[PDB]
Structures are given as structure tokens and as C-alpha cells.
Amino acid sequence: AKRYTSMAYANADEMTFGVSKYPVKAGLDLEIGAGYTIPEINYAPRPEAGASKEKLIKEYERITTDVMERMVQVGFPAIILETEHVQQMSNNPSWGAEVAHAQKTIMEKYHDEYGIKCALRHTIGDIRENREFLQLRGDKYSVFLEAFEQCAENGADLLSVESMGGKEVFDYAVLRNDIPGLLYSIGCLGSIDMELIWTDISKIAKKTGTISAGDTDCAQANTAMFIGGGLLNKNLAHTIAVIARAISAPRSLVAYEAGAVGPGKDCGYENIIVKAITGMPMTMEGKTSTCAHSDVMGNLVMQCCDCWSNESVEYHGEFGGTTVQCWSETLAYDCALMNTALETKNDKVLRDLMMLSDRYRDPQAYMLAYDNAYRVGQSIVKDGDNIYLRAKNAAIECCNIIEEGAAGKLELSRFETKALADAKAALEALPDDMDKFMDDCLTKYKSEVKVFKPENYGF
Amino acid sequence: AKRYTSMAYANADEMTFGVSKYPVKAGLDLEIGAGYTIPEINYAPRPEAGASKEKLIKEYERITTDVMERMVQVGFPAIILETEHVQQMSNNPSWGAEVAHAQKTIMEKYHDEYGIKCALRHTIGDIRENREFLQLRGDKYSVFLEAFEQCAENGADLLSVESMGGKEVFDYAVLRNDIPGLLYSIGCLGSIDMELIWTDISKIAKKTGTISAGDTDCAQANTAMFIGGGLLNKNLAHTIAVIARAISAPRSLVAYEAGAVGPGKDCGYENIIVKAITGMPMTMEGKTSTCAHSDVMGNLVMQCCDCWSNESVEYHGEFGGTTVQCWSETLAYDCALMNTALETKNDKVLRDLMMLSDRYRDPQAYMLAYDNAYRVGQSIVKDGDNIYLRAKNAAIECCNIIEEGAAGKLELSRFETKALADAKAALEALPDDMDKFMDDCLTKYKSEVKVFKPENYGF
Amino acid sequence: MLDFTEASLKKVLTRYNVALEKALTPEEAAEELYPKDELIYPIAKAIFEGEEDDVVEGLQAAIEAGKDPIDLIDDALMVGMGVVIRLYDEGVIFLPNVMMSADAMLEGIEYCKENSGATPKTKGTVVCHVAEGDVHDIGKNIVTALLRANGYNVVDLGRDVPAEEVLAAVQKEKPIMLTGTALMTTTMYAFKEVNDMLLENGIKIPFACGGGAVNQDFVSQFALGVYGEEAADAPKIADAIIAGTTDVTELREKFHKH
Amino acid sequence: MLDFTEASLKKVLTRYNVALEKALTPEEAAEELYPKDELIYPIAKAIFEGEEDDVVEGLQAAIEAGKDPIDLIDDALMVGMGVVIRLYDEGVIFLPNVMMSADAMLEGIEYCKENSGATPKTKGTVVCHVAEGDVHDIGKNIVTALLRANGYNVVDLGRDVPAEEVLAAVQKEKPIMLTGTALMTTTMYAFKEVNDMLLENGIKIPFACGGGAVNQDFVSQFALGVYGEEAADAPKIADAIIAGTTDVTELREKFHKH
Numbered sequence A, B: 001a002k003r004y005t006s007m008a009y010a011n012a013d014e015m016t017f018g019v020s021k022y023p024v025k026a027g028l029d030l031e032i033g034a035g036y037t038i039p040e041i042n043y044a045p046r047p048e049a050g051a052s053k054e055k056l057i058k059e060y061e062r063i064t065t066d067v068m069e070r071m072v073q074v075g076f077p078a079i080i081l082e083t084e085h086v087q088q089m090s091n092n093p094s095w096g097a098e099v100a101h102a103q104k105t106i107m108e109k110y111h112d113e114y115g116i117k118c119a120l121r122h123t124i125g126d127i128r129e130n131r132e133f134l135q136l137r138g139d140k141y142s143v144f145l146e147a148f149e150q151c152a153e154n155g156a157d158l159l160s161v162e163s164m165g166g167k168e169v170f171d172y173a174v175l176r177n178d179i180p181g182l183l184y185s186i187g188c189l190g191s192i193d194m195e196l197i198w199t200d201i202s203k204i205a206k207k208t209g210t211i212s213a214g215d216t217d218c219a220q221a222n223t224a225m226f227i228g229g230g231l232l233n234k235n236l237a238h239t240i241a242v243i244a245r246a247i248s249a250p251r252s253l254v255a256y257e258a259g260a261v262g263p264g265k266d267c268g269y270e271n272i273i274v275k276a277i278t279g280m281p282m283t284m285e286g287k288t289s290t291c292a293h294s295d296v297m298g299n300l301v302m303q304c305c306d307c308w309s310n311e312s313v314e315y316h317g318e319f320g321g322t323t324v325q326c327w328s329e330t331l332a333y334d335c336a337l338m339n340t341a342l343e344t345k346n347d348k349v350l351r352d353l354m355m356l357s358d359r360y361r362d363p364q365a366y367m368l369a370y371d372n373a374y375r376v377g378q379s380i381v382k383d384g385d386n387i388y389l390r391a392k393n394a395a396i397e398c399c400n401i402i403e404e405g406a407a408g409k410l411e412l413s414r415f416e417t418k419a420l421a422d423a424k425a426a427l428e429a430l431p432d433d434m435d436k437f438m439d440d441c442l443t444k445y446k447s448e449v450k451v452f453k454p455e456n457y458g459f
Numbered sequence C, D: 001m002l003d004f005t006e007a008s009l010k011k012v013l014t015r016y017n018v019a020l021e022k023a024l025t026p027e028e029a030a031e032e033l034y035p036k037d038e039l040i041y042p043i044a045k046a047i048f049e050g051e052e053d054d055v056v057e058g059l060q061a062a063i064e065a066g067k068d069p070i071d072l073i074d075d076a077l078m079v080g081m082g083v084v085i086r087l088y089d090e091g092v093i094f095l096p097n098v099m100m101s102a103d104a105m106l107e108g109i110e111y112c113k114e115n116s117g118a119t120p121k122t123k124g125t126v127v128c129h130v131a132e133g134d135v136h137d138i139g140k141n142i143v144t145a146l147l148r149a150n151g152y153n154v155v156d157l158g159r160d161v162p163a164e165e166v167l168a169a170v171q172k173e174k175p176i177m178l179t180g181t182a183l184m185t186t187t188m189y190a191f192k193e194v195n196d197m198l199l200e201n202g203i204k205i206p207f208a209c210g211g212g213a214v215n216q217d218f219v220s221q222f223a224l225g226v227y228g229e230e231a232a233d234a235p236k237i238a239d240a241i242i243a244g245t246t247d248v249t250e251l252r253e254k255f256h257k258h
């Protein structure tokens, strides 16, 4: 709704981890972006626990107890718990609500005993879909909103979702090196959907005195990343994955335009670009989220993180204790290193060290390096009012950034270089006018993708 | 054999991570302490894999393939695999040999294709024991040696053991705040057994062209730490755990005196002291070994590591891939940060940041801080020819160190403080003459500990 | 901000993929494999390029300067495709290049389906599905695309597919092979229902199981189960049914062992 | 090298144990709990202090100025020990203080043997063992102690214990409760052997299982199995046998639900 047309920071060099321009106060005495990074632990219940509401509540009480116990045994000052709903917690609003209430109760107990700072994030499933297609504005919509407000009324401090707007056209395009289809699905359909939902979520957050935290392009940009996989895969050019990431930034940006205040969702790798624009805090994930997946920017993503996440891990036993204890201890220590750097005014060198670790590992890391991310940010805000053109700007800026890198020390394969050159040309041939582009794609994808329903986006 | 009476380094500030004064060359184009840190991945097969030799060999093949595959997919330039023998691999020497062979074969295939540097470490089991007692010089001794040489002849690059000298008296002493018993078990009995085995181990390394790597006081010092547990535990005062650690330093030092060259075993937290004395490279484990256990010095132990380990994890599936893959990726990334620091001449500040992170977390961490570790180093070499007296010096120096800490910003509980004070007085009441102490202890533990067999120590 | 020297970077990481890339460009590589049959040529090249118009254009001229109405599928489309598949296995091209190519071929097949009545011939039917409760499409689609692109008829049962529906389709279509894909722990056990309900109706065909949440040990507790990790493993196992092996134990022996 | 300001240290970590420590020294806290019975007092202070030389001397003086050789077990030794356990529970003293006190008390119990003839009496018999293949003593030793401290009699079967031998001990001593401790995945399965081989010999006493490698769902798969995660759980689960609960499912209801 209220679009960004300038940057929150004067230059990339002002950005650092654990501080952001507009901090968020939430939960039990916690502050985010306020001069300390925070570990944010994620977890998935075992398949059996999903059988009933009571089994699910119990599993999450074991998770929460195990986590808070570990934090106080190792002396950590602060922790965030993120509960990513299984579908049944969102489809039945009161289920997620009762899990939220049960978790908050154990956290309040540890906060009263020890004074440990903490907050709870609930991430509602995007349930606006059936077996045949997306139903972004249908019957499930009202249930979607009830899931948010119920969890907000019963203990959740931060509200997030990984929304599905444009996912269907994305899925078709990403498999086909259809760059304009990437632009339309992520930058356009995604942006439009994001504005609808985030407007409502923020209203709910305000009414219930909780925080409208943010979204992630996980359904599109992360999918491109996983299909791309490691350095030796052959399923998606990494030079195209990175372009998807560039476009994801003005899409994810819309949450904040529409009332969200951060921290953004861990799996929003694009959050570095978003932070450079909004000056809001963001959670990141990388080397300590390998329990969920491999990535090629393990250290770099820490560069300006405010919260540090393990993404997800099943809840089960390891020699060192419970899965959620093992990873929360590692996240917490990573945050201790960063906090020691802040307290001693050595954050900037450490931020640089983190960035440089991965700058040259892959075009996907290269672009996300805080200086290059800020550059992408600049390219979006110069047409900030225009959801299409800002996204197109980002995509081409991305291409320029990678080309420059490749002319220095970024070592791309011939194949990667070609895919990049093809996509830049595809992007430069597009019209500047949004309507022109929106209309051509509407009729193109209506035709090429039969599961694509324009009513999902108010068309 | 040849005792240390001076320090390899002129002062603590010369110490850093990824470099040691005396580097170790080994395996497939790998170098240790040569200007880069190296991840060292550990693992335990599932119970089912122990049925037959072939299932065991198979499990290790899967582990090895999974690790090498991940390293090349994420662009990591180096890796060490450590296989800690299950008991059956050591009791039947050819079992360990054949696992060694199957692992090296795969490692060669990857090294040939991609040029990734790697080395294989086999850690023989200390099998010199039966159901009723230690048998450190019994019939099992020759089998013990056969394990080292068979593995060394069949692909193992580094040779290690976690040896049990003094374990029986330690186990008795640690439950009783018997500080002198700690001194005797670890410092005296431990040191005597260490010299026997490491003379033979080194002889074998030389004969087979492999590396006599080093030992760990796991069986004593780590037991004390694990019983000490978290900050809120009530099983062993942390001020007694750190004393046990200080004494382990000259015990573990014996391996090097007797011919090992490093890198020492990961669970040798006292390796920081050992490095300061010897200038030899050492593996460490902390924040990224939480799959095996919690500790109270997650970041500090990186301060001067040469290799960086996850200690151990069961081989099984996680969302992100196989357990050895998730943890190897985190280790390798931790190394990448360190190596970037080195490349840009920022290692010393990062070293300080890692150290300062945990310096105040616990007395166990405070002492292990590289400046304090060095000081404990100095207290050892000033009587280096004398194994009792050097150990007593370390224990008393440790007490001094924690006390100075406690008068500064180290915040000890009353209970911790009293227990330190009781231990210092008990150490200070002991005689300087070794034979006296040896004789007092011989007769005291003969009477108090029925499983104690003086012949295990040549008495 | 910090930067590396060339020597430093070289020490810190290695993009292993760069040095393993073959010298020839995809185009040059394709050129070494195209038939020089003048008539079949510009079709094979058109498939490789994912350029559907040129596939049609090239098919119109080949039935006018000769015949082969239905044959052009095998003589021109499946030869063009055999080039794409080859280059994909050798890693000189990537998945999307195969997808674009299969799209261009499918439109070239259905254009033959309009100048025929003859009904085309396939190596056999394969039924594909995603375990019920699971929306994860991609891996199935890549199994779908590879199969078709290797010369198989594919009835793709779609996403949240509920067993009863699978049973019914192995009946309607009598396929040589069924495939399954699961990605959530909350979902892999729909391979149960299907394996049991194929047995509880007397059906004995290979059940190629794959998916992120799935490994070689999980599919072995099923008599019909056969693991494939790569999507490129689906047609490779389907070809072992053209060879005669219906026995699952014998398939496992020449396909398992990871 | 770097150091923190006080303000900074306070932000980066918290030694949570420090603020939680009660004000009374252990010494003053035991003082409040000692029986003020003149002749019994020096023996209770002796037990807490874990000082055996003063335990005998205090006991001798007690049987001289009064009577009660065997009676002092429950009047002078169990009362002092009960102070020790309370303070351990409240966390004002640590394990090694409990151990030294148990050493001191056990050396008192056998000095009461030397003036008895009458036989001492206990609340039942517990057999304790570590799984076969397993060398991890410590947890078993803590369970041992806390059992001997809560008034029970314990035959300690030791380390690497083969099951045939658990049978034989359970037969001889007719215990009310069997404890087992396993620490390795490679070793927890010795509870199988034990459980089956008790049912196959028709015994139905509760088998309370613990150790690092073990959890609730694991012990529940055996019929005789009870879980207890902490060592304190050992007497608490044995008190319910003395309360008259022998049914595993009845016992589990109170003690599972972790």
C-alpha cells in the first residue's frame, strides 16, 4: 500500500548484524534489531504427533521445554521459538491457538524463573488451495485469517506466513527457463497477492496487540534454489536461480509496505535486500540450518541478520540431547560470537569476513553480499511505485552485478555465463509499460497453464 | 620419552587458528597447521550395522560417500574423516583395516576427480580391559597394537586412541571431591600409561609411513565435564571440573613427548594448553559438536584450533540430508570463516572474539582461554621432567587463574568458590617429592578401590 | 570492505563445476549427433532448441517431400529427443533444456495425431502419482517428462492422489510400471496403501519409488518397491521391463546397492 | 587482546545459577534440619560432613549412654542421610557430597552389624545392573546410592551383566524392583533379553529402565518396562511398589507422560 521510494540506509556500509533502523519490541522482554542478534529455533513434530490435537500440543510442549531448558543451562540471554504450522493447525484455527497457548505457558514459566528474554513466532500455513488449484480468495480465506487472530489471541507474538501467490505460474516457468514468466509470477502476481493478505494480517496484529512480522518468497525463489541444488547439479542454472532471488525482493518487500514491521522470515534469503530498503529487522538462515537443507551462502547470510535460524529439523533424539537442543545451542553460540563483535565494536570486520567467505562461491551468494544487495535495493526503489518495473529493474540490476563479478574473480562456467546472457536479453526486450506486460502475460499464461485462475489475483 | 621444558611459542599472542609452528603433512595432498583450518567429521554407525562385518563396511561406505559428495557440492576445498572404532573393529584388527580400506578407496576416487584434499583418521578403541578390570599390559596389548598397524597399512592416515590409563581411580575420585585422587589418576597413572602406548604407536606410524596423531583425556577430564553438566546442574562443581582439565594437559602432553606430532583428538579440550607447549596442531570441538553433547565453551575452543570437529553423531536421515552431510557442511563453513580471516590478516581479532565470547561463561572456559591456557602451559614446563610435579603445578596455577578471574568479572557462585578454595588447600598440602606422593597414593587406592591393579602401571 | 587476492580465493573455496565442463558448446555437441538426413535434420535441431513452430514447419515439409505420416514420430521426433536425452545425461545440457524440448516434441506428436487415425505406438504405459497428502509436483513432473521423452505413454495421476484412484488406473491402463513420489515424512506411508492394495488385488509390476523423503531402505519393506534417486532413473528402470525383468528381487539386485 | 566492559558482559551471557543460589551456606542449612536429640545430633552432623571417623565415635557414645545397636540405623543414620537427600533435592549440596555421606553411612551400618545379632530391616530389595556390553557405571552408582539412601537394600550386580545372571539374582534375592542402565544404542537392547527372559521364566516385578540412550517409547515396547529419566526417579518408582502397585500399565500411568 505505501511504497518505498528511497533506502533506509545511506550506504551499504552502515548495515550490520543485530542492529536495524526500526527495532521491534515483543514477547517477554525481547527486542529485535536493538543491538543483539537472537537465535530462532525451528522444529517439526514427528508424524505420529499429528494424529490428534492432544498429541500435537504434547509434542510442542516437549519441544518448548527442551529448548528453554537448554538455553538456561548454557547461559544464553535470549531466544525465539518459531512454530511452522502443520496444515491441520491452520485448517482448524483453534488447534494452532492451543499449541500457541501451551508453548507460551512454558516460556512464561522460564521467563519468571530466570529472566531469559524470549518470543514466540507462529507461521500459519497458506491453506488457500485445493487438490486442483489455488484458491487465494475463496472459502478458505476467512479460515486463514482466523488462524492468525486465534494464535495472536493465545500467545503468539510474531505472525508470519510463506504465501503462495504466483506459485502456479512460477512452477511452470522455472522448469522452462521462462524468465518473463519468473518476472510475472514472482514480481507481479506475488506482489498483488502479498498486498491483499498483508493488509489483513497487519490489521489482525494491531487489533490483538501483536506483531506483523513478514513473509518469504520460499514458494518460488527457494524452489528455484533447491532445483538448482549444489555446484554439480544440472537441473537449473545458478545464474537463473539468482535472478529469481532478485525478483523475490520487491515481492517480499510488499509485506512491509502493507504494515509488517519485521523480523522477516528466516528462509527469506532476499531479506538482505529488503532490510537495506526498509531498515527493518530480518531473520536469516545458512550454515546452521543444514539440518533442513544445503546452501551455498552459509556464512554470508549472517552479515546483517537480526535473528539466526536453523529453518527446520524433525524433533527426535541425538547423542547430545534433543534435536531442538542441539541446534538451538549452535544458533545461540553463533549469535554470541556476533554479540561479542557488537559489544567490542568489531561487528563490521566480522560482517565483512562473513560476506567474503561466500562472495565467490556462487552467483547466488555474490548477489546477496550486502553491498550488492543494497545495489539491488537502489534499483527497486528508483521505480518504487511500480510493482512491475521495480521488479524488472531488480532482475536486470542482478544481471549487471553478476556480469561485473564474472569480469573479476567470480568464476562462472560457460553454461552459467550463457544462461545469464540469454536472460538479460529476455529482460531487456520487455516493455517498460506495466499494463502492456500484465496483459500479454495474462493471456499467455491463461493459455499455457491451465491451472492458472486469474480470479485468484482480482482479474 | 623426551620431556618439554620450554614453550614453542614466546607468548600467547603468537597463537592463532589454522597455523601451528610444526605443521603436519598427510593423506591426499592435505596439510595441517599450514595456514588453513580443516573440518573433521565424526560419525557412529547404527546398531544394525554392527551385525556383520559386511554391513559395517557398507555403512561406512555410505558415510564416506555422503561426506565427500557434500563437500564437492558446496565447494569446500578440504576435509578429514575420523572413524572412531566400534569395539569390534579393534578386537578384530582386520575389521578396522577393511573399513579403512573401503573408506580410502572412495576418498581417492573423489580426490582424483575433483582435487579435494582429504585425510583419514582412525581412532582405535582402547580394548585393554575385561568385565572386571583394566588389563593395560595383558594379552589384549598385542591385539591393540595390531589394530593400529593394520589400519595404518590399509588407508588410515592419522592414528589416535582415547586411552584409559588411570580411569578406575578417576571414576572413584571424581564422585568424592578427592582432588589428590584426581592428581594421581590423571597426572600420574595417566602419564605412565601414555608413555607406554605412545612409544609403541609412534614406532608403528614410522614403520608404516603414517601419522602418530595424539590422544585425549576423554576418559577422565571429559567425564568430569559431562558430570559437571550445565550451569544449573548439581553433580560436580565446575571449579573442580576445570581442575581436572588443567591436570589432563600434562597427561595428554606425553603422547607428543613420546613421538606423536599431532593433530590431537577433538575431544581433547586441553589441546589448547598442549599446542602452547608443543607448537603442534590440534583438533577442537565446541558449538558444532552439539550433536554429541552440550558444552560451555562453544566458540572459545576455535580460538586456536587447526581442525574442527562435531565429535560424533549417529548416521541417519535429517530433512537436509544425511546427518554426516548436515554437520560436515556446518563444520566446513565454520572453517571457511576462519580461513577468510587468515587470508585477510584478520585472524587475531576473530581469535579474540571467539575467546571473549565464552571467557566469562564458566570457569571451565575461563582457564581454557588461550592466554590462560598459555600460562598453565608455563607452569608445566618449569618442572617438565617431573610428571607429578608438573601436573600439580598446572592444578595450582589453574586455581590461581580462576581466583584472579573471580576477583575480576568471572561470576562464581558461593558453592563454586568454596569448592575451588577447598581444592586449592588440598593441592597445596601435598608434598613436592613425587615418590612420597606415589607411595601414599599406591597404598591409599589399593585399599579404597578394589578394581585398582597396580601392575597395570608396572608397579 | 574486505576482498580476496586471487591466491587467497583459490585457497578458500573451489567451484568444482567449472573445471569439469566439457570444451564443446551445447550447440557443437548437438551438431555431432544430429542425423544428416536433410529431411530429419531440421526437425531434430528444432526439438533440441525447444522451438515448436520449426518442429511443425519441419514436419509439414517431410510428409510432402516423402510420406511417413505416423512414422515421423519415431524417425524424426524420437531421434531429435534421443539427442536431448544424451546431452542431458552427459551434463552438457540442463533440465529446463529437456523440458523446452519435450514441450516442442509433444506438439509435434499431436500434429502427427491429426494426419493419421493410425494410433501411435509406445514402449508401454507408465502410471505416475504423488502420494496422497503431498503437493510436491516437481520430482514427479521430471519423472513424467523424462519417461515421455524416452518414448513412453504417461498417465500422470497428479498430486494428492488417494490410492483407490491409483488401483483403478493400473486397471484401466495395464501399465508396465507404476511410479510414486513422496517428500514429507507425513506422506511416504501412502506407498503402503498402494503397495498393499496392488497385492490385495493380485498385481505384480515394478513400483519405482522416489522423492526426497524416501531412500533405498524404506522402499525395500515393500515387495513391489524399487528405489530411484535420480529422475533419470525412471526410464532406465522402465527399460529393464522391455528387457524382460518383472521380478522385483532381480531388479533390486541390478539397481539398489547404494 | 579484547575484553568486555561490565555492561557488555551482562548483555552477552548470564550465569543463571548465580542468582538462584540460596543465601544459607550448606552448613547452616543442614543445621536447621538436624535432629536436636543431643546424642543423635553428632551422628547426623557426622553423616552430612561425610566424616566416618566421627560417625563411629558418635555411635559408640550413643550405645554407651543408651542402648540400641540396630535401632540407630533408622534413628541416627537414616535421619542424617535424610537431611543429605533433602539438601541434594533442594540443590544446596551436590552429588559428591551425597556420595561421601553414603560412604560414611554405609560404614556406620556395618558397625551396627558388629553389635546386633538381631538382623537389620529394609523396605524391600532392589537389584541393579548395567546392560551387557555396557561399561557406563556412574548413573547406576547414583541410582544405587539414592536407593540405599531412601531405606532400600541393593545387591549391585555391576557392569557388563549378561541377563542369565540378572535372572539368577532376581531369583535369589526376590527383589521388589529391578533397575537397568544403558548408555549406548548398541547396548540398550539388552533390556529386550532381560525382559523376555523374565517373562519366559514367569516373573512379574517392575523393571525400571534408565540411562542416556533410553527414552519412554523405548521402554514401553517391553511388558515389564518402566521409564525413569533422573536417578531420583528410582526411589520414587520403588515407593509405589511399597504403595502396592505391581501392574506395569498402572505404574506407567503415574510415571510416563513425560
Ligand SMILES: [K+]
Pocket (backbone or CB within 6 Å): A084, A162, A218, A267, A311, A312
Ligand atoms: K519453512
Ligand SMILES: [K+]
Pocket (backbone or CB within 6 Å): B084, B162, B218, B267, B311, B312
Ligand atoms: K570420542
Ligand SMILES: [Zn+2]
Pocket (backbone or CB within 6 Å): A162, A216, A218, A219, A222, A267
Ligand atoms: Zn520457507
Ligand SMILES: [Zn+2]
Pocket (backbone or CB within 6 Å): B162, B216, B218, B219, B222, B267
Ligand atoms: Zn572422546
Ligand SMILES: [Zn+2]
Pocket (backbone or CB within 6 Å): A316, A317, A318, A323, B316, B317, B318, B323
Ligand atoms: Zn537426527
